[PDB]
Amino acid sequence: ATFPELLRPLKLGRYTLRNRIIMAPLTRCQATEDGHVPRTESMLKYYEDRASAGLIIAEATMVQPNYTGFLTEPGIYSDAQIEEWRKIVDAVHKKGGLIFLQLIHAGRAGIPEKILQQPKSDQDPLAGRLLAASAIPIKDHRIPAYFAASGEKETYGVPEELTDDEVRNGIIPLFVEGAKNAIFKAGFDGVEIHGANGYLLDAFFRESSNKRQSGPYAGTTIDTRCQLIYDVTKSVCDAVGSDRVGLRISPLNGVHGMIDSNPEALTKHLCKKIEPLSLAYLHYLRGDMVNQQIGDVVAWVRGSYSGVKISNLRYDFEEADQQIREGKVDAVAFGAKFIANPDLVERAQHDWPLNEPRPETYYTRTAVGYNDYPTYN
Template sequence: MTLPSLFSPLSIGSHELSHRVVMAPLTRMRAGRPGNVPHALNVEYYRQRASKGGLIIAEGTQISPSGQGMPATPGIHSPEQIAGWRDVTDAVHAEGGLIFLQLWHVGRISHSSHQPAGALPVAPSAIAAAGNAFTASFERVPFETPRALETAEIPALVESYATAARNAEAAGFDGVEIHGANGYLLEEFLQSRTNQRTDAYGGSIENRARLVVEVASAVAGVWGPERVGIRLSPFGIANDSGEADPMPLYSHVIRELAKLRLGYLHLIEPRASGAGQAEVDHKDVPSAAELFRPIWPNVLIAAGNFRADTAEAAVAEGKADAIAFGRLFIANPDLPERLRRGAPLNPYNRATFYGGGVEGYIDYPALDAAKAAE
């Protein structure tokens, strides 16, 4: 029996990937303003990173105006945003690639400057996150105490995910990923430290998982489950998140999601939690993919501080079916080909991750360009 490798084909539902090097969803804060509309700069960024038979998971994209938490992040709730994303998906498809959209609501990880009419951000409970928010003008200020969602508001919230999924379909995406990780709204409902509700969405593990399952079911109803993925960070600590004992909670969640037959589960490895904000490599932590692989029957994508050798090993050993790369994909638009050849990698410039223009976004050289410059 031949072991799978990073460059073995892989099926996600009806989609056929020619390799297993996935581009992770990456917040870059470069959407056009006003309106948070994808524009020509974003089209070129994604076009550069498309590869034949490769999967891109586009950056977190707010499902509604109240879902926004950072400046210049794209949405999928206006006609202009749908049209802007259509230009992106057309460019990726022209290169032979596939692209899913990550559906995002940040919950309490926001600021009133992003919210309609300057309202407070919403969350499961009125508990402020530790740390600093990005305001609409890129300033950093302490997080505000959010407003707890009323029980009667939750059906409309679930429907806003379904509407965003329909809009993603109109924009030409090949599927969608639900963002249930990194301390944003859905994870806030999951975790006991951020969810102190006493209604049907709080208290027990089953109740705290209810919203995630309802959202996944609603989105699967739009796309068909095989074209829907979900991202979770069971051991994560990003954005003041974290569950004291993650195994009972996330084992329940993953088993319930498995019943929906979603196309893939995307797990962030704990050693990389918070990696977007600083260089991290948390020591002596478990492997999320290894722990939850036995209870997830479909494709499993792992992300978090992988190198070529560790990615290859994770796939060969069956711990994951594909590996998502973030920072390395920022700096290496042709990352799959570089990994295939064992070629050197461009270093990334953390100072240009968030906001700005061309620098650190579409000016990283591909292999052939790099050789020509030598």
């Protein structure tokens, strides 16, 4: 067998995966701009073609109405959304695959020209507002043209600092409802909490974006920075069962100028803090997409977390295989390689050559660079 450790089944929460080749969450922007409804026609084909994966983690999907970071990403808050997702999940299950939905709040990376143009009036006190841990806008980065309202690069806006009461009673229940919608109604096998990549939860977790001076979510200690990640995940687990809940973090990922001054101590503490939750897994970016911050995230997690360990970032089959054989990680999620290879698992199984990804077409909103990468045959 080509990569015996990587191709071996894995117990994950209440499931047994067929293999340890995980499909990473990948925003591809194939939902409607109006109601963030999945465009079933394309998304069903896309995911069903990739259902040989050990597990699919579906793309970041909104929990708060209209709070869009990506212009055309899907939501999981409305009945319309749930109905299209249910059809997508049924098709993966028909192929025998497993699918978790990633749940996101874009925080300070929300698109100002979309969010700020729903009127500021009640029925929803969170609507019409940019929200984050602190009033610290993303600096010296522009909203990419493929996410921007216009279709041309835009400036991130200045967010409002969430009150302790809005976090506990405004943000957390949206994740809970989003997760119940995902699992109980659309039939998802699980949900992944989006604690990474500069979004709401990561922004509370790392020092650079959390300067709150007081309360349970303060920026002033490692434990209080961990608390929003904790409280969201815990409330979700209570409603849906911990065996159907994953968490993603990226303690070294410098997107949007995110940085913590002690990522090793932060990560290790997070691990001990979420241990009693008995999650289905912890999924982490082992590094920086920019290649600047360094640290062996794999070893930090291995030393302080005893549940399922899913790593990610510039893996190939051989590295994944050998990190699993050495006991460093339990599974590996692949991003770009799944974009380019719907039959990635088959290619591992016969060591077949791999299609090359084309980043230039990652976000077309059409079939081009989305559903046109062929299987090997």
